[PDB]
Every structure is written in structure tokens, then in C-alpha cells.
Write a protein that binds this ligand. Sequence first.
Ligand SMILES: N[C@@H](CCC(=O)N[C@@H](CS)C(=O)NCC(=O)O)C(=O)O
Lengths: 223, 241
Amino acid sequence: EQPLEGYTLFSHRSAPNGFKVAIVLSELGFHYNTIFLDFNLGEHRAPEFVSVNPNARVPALIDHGMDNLSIWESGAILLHLVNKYYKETGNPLLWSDDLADQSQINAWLFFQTSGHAPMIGQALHFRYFHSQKIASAVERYTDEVRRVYGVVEMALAERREALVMELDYPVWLVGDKLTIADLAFVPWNNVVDRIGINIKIEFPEVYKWTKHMMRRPAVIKAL
Amino acid sequence: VEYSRITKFFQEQPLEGYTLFSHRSAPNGFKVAIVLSELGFHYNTIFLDFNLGEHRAPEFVSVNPNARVPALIDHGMDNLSIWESGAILLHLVNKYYKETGNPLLWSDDLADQSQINAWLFFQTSGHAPMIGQALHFRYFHSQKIASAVERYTDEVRRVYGVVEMALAERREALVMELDSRFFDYPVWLVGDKLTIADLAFVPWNNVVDRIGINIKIEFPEVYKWTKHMMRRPAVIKALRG
Ligand SMILES: N[C@@H](CCC(=O)N[C@@H](CS)C(=O)NCC(=O)O)C(=O)O
């Protein structure tokens, strides 16, 4: 009894990557169900779900309208959603119709899913869940996460500079418009204080940037 | 620190073509070269000397903020600059497609592009990073942490199991599709054709021995999969160049 249209999102109550898909889905006006799996009971490893996501992790998204197509990596899901919306509307919302812009959005998106999220996750593990407490390991990742934020900080700082040379405004990573590249960081920005990173104090531009995204109803509507 | 050489480059950039900033010991650097080669895109490679801090060159950091390799400059597109191996592959297959109409190593169907993307993000997010951490604690950390090594080594084997399970399922599909003597026919991750999804793993598959993983014995399907790709000329030329 699978739906004819719409979407179903598998996630976790604590998953920042799961929230990343919820935000995009709501921002694009797509209709969706949300099934939160309970890891403790190994629902993310049960056959029926590995059939959906071979990697057995959330998020995962079933595009009912597309014959129950399963897209499983959070980054792949975003690319699917913005591609789907552009194709249906002709409007590259949170995306771009220009190939050069697309390459940039993807650059920041891969940077986020591959160099920002994993590092924050390793920082969280060694600090709260490792079988042993090792500071060198915790420091390795908190340091790397700070380097990453320094990268986005420097980027936004230059977008700011450019804007100012154009005599209080929001600045974005690509094409001076909100995109999945910017939204990909939101769920994680909101949790790094758990590893001792105070964005407000340490990364001013990132603080503004993230403040602008948290004030969006579509980002609140699902958080 | 001396990057005068890198600064000179950004003063005189070719009309068109591609310049690739890589490093001889960077698997993702070669992932790009492979695809670049498979698509017939002519490119020159500059191996950044991190020891000399060339990656700190203002002209390089401008083109690529994360100051890490690989990074590709598309001189034909006003010297556009893509800085993530995953974003570089997508740019290449897309550019190739609109220029020829033949989605080589790609797909023209949205559903297939999504499946390819899944495996691509997976390799860049769950594959490469975990192998990186495994190598780090095994050989480069300031101290020895056995548990940290076991953790990432366990994860690298887990992610390989996923690819193995996936390739095994594709195998059975093709077997019970005309039948066995078809136990060594080439199998691919999506659409029964080689795509950037399969190619993304090869440079790294050759590195996992350093962390004690033996693909040929522990992951048979992954082994056949790697060998088929390894015998392609474009591949050989890339890993060799
Ligand atoms: N690269 C993946 C990461 C997926 C991921 O880390 N999922 C977590 C959510 S916190 C999960 O399922 N954790 C359960 C587990 O590790 O057992 C993506 O962005 O989709």
C-alpha cells in the first residue's frame, strides 16, 4: 500500500543529515511522510530497509511518484530534489540553471557531506561515545572542524566584501542566492556547540549566515 | 615556503583545456585524472608541493578555498575552478554530455543519475574519509590508539561489504537473465554500464592493503570489478601519467 505520489523520508530524531532533507523538501513545497527509525532496535539494519539503503543508514528517500525510487545519500537526495523541482517548474530554486554555478554548489555540497559532517561526527564519537577517553583524538577532529568553518568563514567574508563594495544583507556561498550548498550546513551548525565550538564568537560571518537560515519558516517548520 | 611557480601559472592560463592540481600520493587526485582520461579531455597536471607550501599560494587558495587537492581548472569556461573530486566528476560528465549528447560514464535518465549520485556521495563521504582515518591512526597519529585503528578498519570493511553485497546482487540478476559461465562477466553499480560511480573507487581500492584489507580474498566481486576497470587504457594512462 505504497503512495501514488509524494515522498517518504526515513530519518532519525537526532540525525542532522535527516533534517537536511526535511528542510529542502519543505522549502521546495514537496509533500512527505517521515518515518523515524529506532537504531537501538536495529530498524536501520532490517532487510526491508537495507533494500532501500544498502548502506543501512538514514536519510533515505522514496520518490513514490517515480515508481518508489530510492535515493539514499543525503547529498544525492538534495541533488535529486532540486533537479526534480527545476525540471517540473523551470525555476532553479535553491539550485541554478547555469552549469558553472552548479559545479560550485556541488563543490560546497561535497565539501559539506565529505569534509564537514564526517569530521563533526568523529569529534562527537571520541568525546561522548568512544570506549576510552583520548584527547589527542578529540582535538584532531575539533581542530579539523574549526579549519572547515574557517574555510566557509573566509568565503562568506569575501562575499560580504563584494556586497559592501556595492554601497545589513544576507550573503551566500554561490551565485548570491540561497542554495542547497548553504542549507547543507544548517543542521550541523546548530550542533557544534556540543563539541565546544561557539560559532557566534568564533565565526561572525558564519553566525550571520546561519542566523539567516534558522529564521526561515521552512527550516523551522521541520526542526 | 615558495610558490612562485604556482603564482606564475595563474598569471598565464591557457585559452582552453584543463589544468589539474594533484599530488602523487592522493587517490582522489587520480580519481579525477581517470575520469578526465576516460572522457578524452586533454589536461596537464601540476603536483603541488605541500612541503614548499604551494597549497598556501594566494592564487591557489582563491581558486580553491579548502587549499586541498584535487582541484580542476576549466580554462574554456573562463578558467572556472572546481575543488571537490565528487564535484569535479559531475562537472565532467555533464560537460561531456551537453557537448556530445552521449552520457558517457553518466546517464541521461534522472533515476540513474540519482543512483550514480548515491554511490558517488557514499564513496566520498563514507569510503574515502574512513580509509583516511584508518591510515591516520595506523601510521600518522601522535600516539598509538588501537581502538581508533580497529574502529575505522572495521568501518572500511563494512563499507566494502556494502559494495560487495550490491555487486553480488547485480551478479545474480544477470546470471538469472540467461542461464554458470557468466560468473565473471563485467558487472556495474548502475545501469549495467561503467559510470563515474564505479570509477570513483578504483584509486582507493588499491590503497586498502596498507590497512590490512585483502580485496581478492575478502571481497571477490569487488576484486573482479576492480580488475576490469584496471585493464582499460584510459585508466592505465591516468594512474601511470
Ligand atoms: N553520508 C551519509 C551519512 C549518513 C549517516 O551518518 N546517518 C546516520 C544518522 S546520525 C545513521 O544512520 N546512524 C546510525 C548508525 O550509524 O548506526 C549521508 O549524508 O546521507
